[PDB]
């Protein structure tokens, strides 16, 4: 089955996204911040990254930048899921290599539709 790296500083947020991903048979690996997410890429290669922006230690913009700078990391598709819904914030994220930006609050069903689209 497909493997998703879920990167967000909220345990409550990770729980509900993980539940919806596991409804579709996907495996889920969690990271509490950007640095931990990049450390987890040494263990495995995910099929998709779900990434928040506002995290301690390393923010999502820094993560996106670091993903593009490493040969093996830059082709992993990333969906940014964030409360930072502004148009300049989206443009920056897309310019840093994110495939899609989705705003919080979000619809779990719409989120899973988009996860399916990128995984196929």
């Amino acid at each position: 089955s497909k493997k998703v790296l879920l990167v967000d500083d909220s345990a409550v947020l990770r729980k509900i996204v993980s539940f919806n991903l596991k409804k579709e048979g996907y495996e889920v690996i969690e990271a509490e911040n950007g640095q931990i997410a990049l450390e987890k890429l040494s263990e495995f290669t995910p099929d998709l990254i779900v990434l928040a922006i506002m995290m301690p230690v390393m923010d999502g913009f820094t993560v996106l930048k670091k993903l593009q700078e490493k040969e093996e990391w830059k082709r992993i598709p990333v969906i940014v899921l964030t409360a930072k819904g502004g148009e300049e914030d989206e443009s920056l994220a897309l310019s840093l290599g994110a495939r899609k930006v989705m705003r919080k609050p979000f619809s779990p069903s719409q989120f899973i539709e988009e996860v399916k689209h990128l995984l196929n």
Binding site: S10, A11, I16, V57, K104, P105, F106, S107, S109
Partner: protein
């Protein structure tokens, strides 16, 4: 205070309230669309998340309203005989869950024997303690194994002296004179992700000063902070 801080304040309200709302909506929609895919314990767990996130949102609305009432000069205080040792322990218990989510240990010492009796409004002083305890958690170090917030209760100068000590990020010198102002937040690389309005310490200062007390701070950047609350006995 100023108008640029008002705009930042309005944006900060939106973002702090958006986080619990995201959980409320995501959990509610998940339950609605997954009734056949939820066991009883998970259904109950997910409902509990909605309730607990609604309660945090409620507390954030109470902050806004208490601030407006303090600015209107409509917030009355009502004093009575209260044991502060029991009051502090109650506040410590109320924040343990939040402190655990950021790996912060919450401690309580008393330099004098308990009970420590004092003529105070119990709900408003609890609110002062909760604001200081919350800040100790919110502005704790990012990655450290020994993070704490400690309440030290003591009697001094014909009054009660409450110290809330932490080993968090600390506060720079130029900021120390402004942290008690309404809407003021330290804008740095160590606060960018921390939610807040800049009202907490403004509310705390006024509640303390309505009791005939004062509040001040000592802090070292990278070491931590000590907030001192003195109230007449």
């Amino acid at each position: 205070r100023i108008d640029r801080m008002k705009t930042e304040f309005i944006a900060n309200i939106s973002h702090e309230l958006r986080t619990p709302l995201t959980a409320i909506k995501a959990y509610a929609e998940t339950i609605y669309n997954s009734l056949g895919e939820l066991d009883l314990s998970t259904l109950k767990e997910f409902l509990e998340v909605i309730i607990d996130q609604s309660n945090h949102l409620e507390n954030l609305l109470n902050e806004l309203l208490d601030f407006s009432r303090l600015e209107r000069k409509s917030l009355q205080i009502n004093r009575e005989k209260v044991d502060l040792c029991d009051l502090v322990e109650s506040a410590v218990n109320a924040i343990k869950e939040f402190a655990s989510s950021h790996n912060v240990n919450v401690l309580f010492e008393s330099n004098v024997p308990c009970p420590v009796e004092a003529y105070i409004d119990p709900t408003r002083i609890r609110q002062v303690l909760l604001n200081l305890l919350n800040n100790g958690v919110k502005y704790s170090k990012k990655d450290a194994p020994d993070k704490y917030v400690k309440v030290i209760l003591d009697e001094k100068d014909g009054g009660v002296l409450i110290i809330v000590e932490d080993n968090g990020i600390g506060i720079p010198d130029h900021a120390k004179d402004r942290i008690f102002e309404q809407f003021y937040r330290v804008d740095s690389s160590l606060t960018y992700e921390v939610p807040g309005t800049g009202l907490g310490l403004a509310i705390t200062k006024e509640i303390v000063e309505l009791h005939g007390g004062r509040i001040w701070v000592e802090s070292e950047v990278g070491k931590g902070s000590r907030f001192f609350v003195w109230i007449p006995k």
